[PDB]
Symmetry: D2
């Protein structure tokens, strides 16, 4: 396992504490054995997500201080528009308060646009893998969300360079089965979050786009982690070996017609989103009409002018290679410490998180007793570290039978915020999990106390068996 | 006119400039004669709105610096929940990125809840006056928005203590006409924005609520300007003469079942919103489910933890009587300067803006040629001041005929941001408007250089006749 | 009296409060009838000084966030060096923590340098008027401080364009009487602080410098209020009518060999000082050797890197003409309000304060009972405003007699911080003083409760007679 | 070597870069082969000092935003006064812009006070080891500075718990030789900076004070690193094994009459100093009289109000045992990596820095050709790390001989700022120096290209022999 040194130094700290074992026990109980309900004051290292918890630089804070709060025509709106043109070569932007706000603005518009023509009678969206909010917006607008990530993604321990790739065969099959008239859009998720933050190669992006253009399908690049994706392209694709990260990004965006982006990820913010449209003025116009009632006036889109200013600077900092090398090498370091100790993970590690296969750690716990959640709860009780479940607890029940939907993998996600934790915090997390090796055998499994009909993952209360 | 001194001093300034008249001319020329498309660098004093342009205190900025960005369970979410309980006595809160995000969360849920029971077959919402985003969410959810503000509001020059009051007779008629089963909710807007920022009295709020409860109708308090409303109750209602602002606020919230709030207004923020629900756990639960896909996870609701922290401090600062007395006395000063010089305004002045009747100043320009906007542009070319048109340009066309709807008022809104401008900036606005008197007579009227089917006012290109 | 509008708007406020009469009585008593000993919490509007209490801009605070804290070689040290070259054309700088720190570095060095040659046997310093700290350093180094300001300065009510000028006849007499060999340096104070913030004309600066260079005397420009001085030159000297403020500044510094500067005045800071030397490398080298033990390493001089960064931005903002016009116009507005009510002031008003000639207000109080201090205390008690005495209280005892040294003028200085208070705060101050008109005759006078041997103006405890 | 994990996480970063070798070479050349004249932009990791380069917390930054800039009676002045009472039990404070400002205020006053009695005819100061500025102020006031640190301090590789201790026998001998009447003060430096940041034991501090009080000698505690000293007492003295850090601190200050403090060290600030006097009101009054001309008015002492506010919070954070354990453990980590690799260091490591012996690394370079500076320079050329030479280049020339003074040691000081660098930056430094091992043998030595008289080390330009 190799530690990579920060290409920055610390300028401001925030105190963190390890609550006592007694305090953690009381807190977990109070939270109904569901870490999502814990107050942040009961957490030492928080690995719930890499969304909006990042540390900004002094230049981002400085940009906030001088941000223009004007209701219309903020200076920072124009700077953001120029930044999006510089990075992606896209001519239109609509700021949004966060990624799911950008989805909310654009997706209904793309459906309406396909329907206007008389098409989209049985509308679907196709993606390598739809993130949870993205799929939620697809479904709320009456469409079907289809995921066709390569099957190499489901082979956890086997190394592959590009586990976020679309399965091209399945794409062609879906187009023939549903008809191009029913495909509202293809959503290319970079990096492919739900497959473990695995990169999509340039040639796969290009082939997907070429096919889409042969059938007139609109392509949207879900870009929360577009920089981590570009780093991996540069690291693993010989063709981009000597290219700068911005060159890679520039080529990637040749293969989409628009982007939706959570700026809470790669652009190193605490809040913020964006819609950028390459050149379709009609889509831009319609998306602006929806922006007004849902997010805000079109030159701020539900953000303070200081957050647009921070976004402009964060977009530049998120592309820097020295930073990306360190950031992703840190996630790899954590992954390697775990792997070297016999803990099974998705390998290789993606850009922002390490996924631990809990099935192999607790064979005695059946899917429906949430084995990944039992590991997470033990980790919490043992170290004050908060991780999140990507398994059968999250998957939920089959609506037709009302039975626990079958979960192929029982993952614990160790999600890492950008520029917040050092490699010694990474060692603390790895030692806590390795240390549970002889406790895994005795873990019991959990039951429901209160099971909500929807979004159970977030508020269900549980109890050990 | 009486000037009231600031109960604070200046700690940080932001530079503003009066572009040269040719710059102004060039700018307005280039903006297609429509100030909602000017960049903020073309503006000297901005009076477009009082939303999100406020100046925060040093305690608000300090609260931002230590705000908790945790994804779940932020410390500032708990502080906000306690502050809402303290101010309104409401037990449930859902943060939102801004007021229209709170409307988007709650309104669909209220409709579904009324329909769940089998009711709401021809659904309507009734308000003293629906703000523009509020009415847009009502209509987007297939409902009708009915406004029943007292007719005293339309008598501009005649003083009345309570021009934002609901007409109780029209309320009872609407209930009988539509049926209580069709009334999804009553929306009490305080202050009554669309009537000129005019207060709703405590006895009117109470009567509306009592009637609503007889019929089982849910009442929502649209609270962007609740503190300005409470100041006016304390100033004009003998019953609250010796009460504190917080006591007034506490009594007001006994007359609603929930509130929607743009925290960009009275709570003195640049971004931020809130949904608070008094005690209906089921509505809370359903609103939480909608919050997730639209705004964000339920403990941050599309806000950075630093903005929840500023919001807690801002809610406290917004209730301070000395500040409210100053703030509202500044708007009354600008109004009195105008009134004393013979410019007709809605009187008395509301909490946050001065409304000027432009029909009376440019009689030769008919509604369809935009009298208010020609006043607005003139005001921009002469002084760099950007005001907003509340008239024929804003009213729009009637889709049935494509007929320019008839406005009964051609207003110029002079909207004032909190703690940003001095009484001297107020004298600059008034003198510039009083300096136009000779030119009003020679004012032309504008034509459309480019007109859009929706967002007219935001994006239409116009040209002088 | 004419109110001039701010060329900026407010971005951050600081709450201020009027303590009750009961609190003000208690506080003044506790501070032994000496406002210098009051806590800031017992003060409403603070007019004690215009030093370090200014309001910075958003660009100044932004500059502080990215400031380089490096011990040696800070980026901001090089920016400050380039800024001093740009403004003054001086090639060497030494930062200092504030203006008396710059005096402490430079004055000892100039003495030593004059003595090295065998001169300076009975060393003196000559100025138009030595500020208090400046004279203190002159005396601490065993030298005599001589002040030769024009006699027009002592004629309060009679207008003169240049009351800070040096009396050229007295200069030539002093050179002849002491000998050029005994004159360590001439100190040109701009504006002339002790004369009421009155400007020194360009032709007087030039004449003084030409004379100094005939006798080989070193000239130091005490520059705390160099921008206020430059504004007055542009406003009153026909030769600079069309010049920019920077052109005026560039010409003024042609008439000195070095400068000492409190950056807490015109450069708009809360802390900060500077030594700049035109071209004498030897003086620079000696001043750098003294800087090390007294202030800090030579590339920070007792300042954080964030304060050097703010100083670079402040230096530029302090020169803006629209800001100086407003600022100086605010001080003239307060002075004109007083003059129009028959309150005798130094006229015309200087750049940063209004001086109220208290000998005329309180004739019944003789110097040694401190007339100006009697006015200040009554003003404090009546309004919460804190001002400062520029009279016989400050003048202190005669070292020969041990009795009250005789005082020319008995002034009350109303010192105005930059960008902090509005013209409504000025009205407040003027109205409180004007409202004391009838009380002036009966004012009792002051005795000592405790008199410190030196610097008694800062800590003496006094009692009302 | 053991890595200790941070008891905080990162909230703001500052980018740092490793110049290229080319750049590195160019820059060092341009700088005259001397790192005290390099600009910070040519440095990757800066180990010049631990003074004022620390990272503050979010609570410190927040405290700055609400700091009171009042000229007199700032709220923060009173908070600081209470804080010094709480920590040290001292009743009087005088803020100072930094530690040498505090020395400048107090030392001349102690001299004068001893002389007032007719004593101090051949005045001396005695310390375990006077820091450089401290000795400079002693000498500038005509006194002799005597250092009597235990001889255990000069035995680099031999472990001793208390290498900063005074040699009590030499103390008694010096008192007998000079006479108590000539001893202006004893200065107890904690930790003992010049001995390598080595702690002074409680029992040594107590014994020194007891002896002083018997002779009537005033004791001053030089407190820049009082918290690091307190940590070591708790770690190594069995009597304080279960005491809190604050208890240890409280006891330490029982053994002094006053303190001088650079708050740029343990209090975690970028600027700031303090004078605190236990109970001698006369010393306090005299020190306040000198504070006025040299530093500022007595309630701010040359600091902005925001820096006093940060100091109050910094003083509390610098006492936190978890932080101190991490901080001191990080220095120990760096020392253990060097020692485990065979690099000779002062052992055990002190609180804030690692001292390396370059005499043994490059025996082929005489003292006069600068053995430590050639390690530093190559260290800089290979890694971009800047350290400070504590040896022959620092030492100078004997005043009466004028030849290169004999340097006992040829120490490279690796000084570590608080909360700025991670343990991976520590590895980067350890690796850079370890990887020089082979390469050391070929090092040449350096001569002067330009050697200034008394500003040698900061200024001399040098070249390689
Ligand atoms: K966040
Ligand atoms: K805003
Ligand atoms: K200050
Ligand atoms: K510093």
């Amino acid at each position: 396992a190799k530690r990579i040194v920060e290409p920055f130094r610390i300028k401001m700290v925030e105190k963190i504490r390890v609550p006592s074992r007694e305090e953690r026990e009381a807190a977990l109980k109070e939270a109904g054995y569901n870490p999502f309900l814990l107050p942040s004051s009961a957490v030492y290292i928080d690995l719930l997500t890499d969304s909006g918890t990042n540390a900004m630089s002094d230049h981002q804070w400085a940009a906030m201080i001088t941000g223009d709060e004007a209701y219309a025509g903020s200076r920072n709106y124009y700077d953001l528009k120029d930044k999006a043109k510089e990075l992606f070569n896209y001519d239109y932007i609509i700021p949004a308060h966060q990624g799911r706000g950008a989805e909310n603005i654009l997706f209904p518009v793309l459906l309406k646009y396909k329907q206007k023509e008389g098409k989209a009678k049985n509308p679907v969206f196709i993606s390598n893998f739809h993130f949870d909010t993205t799929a939620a917006h697809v479904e709320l607008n009456g469409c079907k969300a289809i995921n066709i990530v390569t099957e190499k993604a489901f082979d956890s321990e086997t190394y592959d360079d590009w586990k976020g790739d679309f399965d091209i065969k399945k794409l062609k099959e879906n187009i023939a089965q549903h008809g191009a008239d029913n495909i509202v859009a293809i959503v290319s998720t970079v990096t492919c979050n739900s497959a473990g933050g695995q990169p999509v190669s340039m040639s796969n992006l290009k082939e997907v786009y070429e096919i889409a253009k042969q059938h007139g399908i609109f392509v949207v690049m879900d870009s929360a982690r577009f920089c981590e994706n570009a780093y991996f392209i540069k690291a693993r694709d010989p063709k981009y070996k000597n290219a700068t990260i911005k060159e890679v990004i520039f080529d990637m965006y040749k293969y989409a017609d628009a982007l939706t982006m959570s700026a809470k990820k790669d652009p190193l913010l605490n809040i913020g989103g964006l819609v950028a449209i390459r050149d379709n003025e009609e889509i831009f116009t319609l998306a602006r009409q929806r922006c007004v009632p849902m997010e805000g006036f079109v030159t701020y889109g539900g953000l303070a002018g200081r957050d647009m200013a921070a976004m402009v600077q964060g977009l530049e900092e998120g592309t820097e290679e020295e930073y990306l090398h360190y950031r992703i090498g840190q996630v790899k370091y954590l992954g390697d410490r775990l792997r070297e100790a016999g803990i099974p993970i998705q390998y290789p590690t993606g850009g922002h998180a390490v996924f631990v296969d809990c099935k192999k750690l607790v064979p005695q716990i059946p899917g429906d007793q949430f084995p990944a959640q039992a590991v997470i709860n033990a980790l919490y009780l043992e170290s004050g570290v908060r991780a999140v479940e990507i398994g059968s607890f999250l998957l939920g029940r089959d609506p037709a039978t009302g039975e626990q939907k079958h979960a192929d993998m029982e993952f614990m996600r160790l999600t890492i915020a950008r520029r917040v934790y050092t490699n010694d915090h990474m060692d603390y997390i790895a030692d806590a999990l390795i240390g549970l090796k002889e406790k895994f055998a005795t873990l019991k499994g959990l039951e429901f106390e209160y099971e909500p009909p929807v979004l159970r993952h977030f508020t269900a209360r549980l109890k050990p068996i």
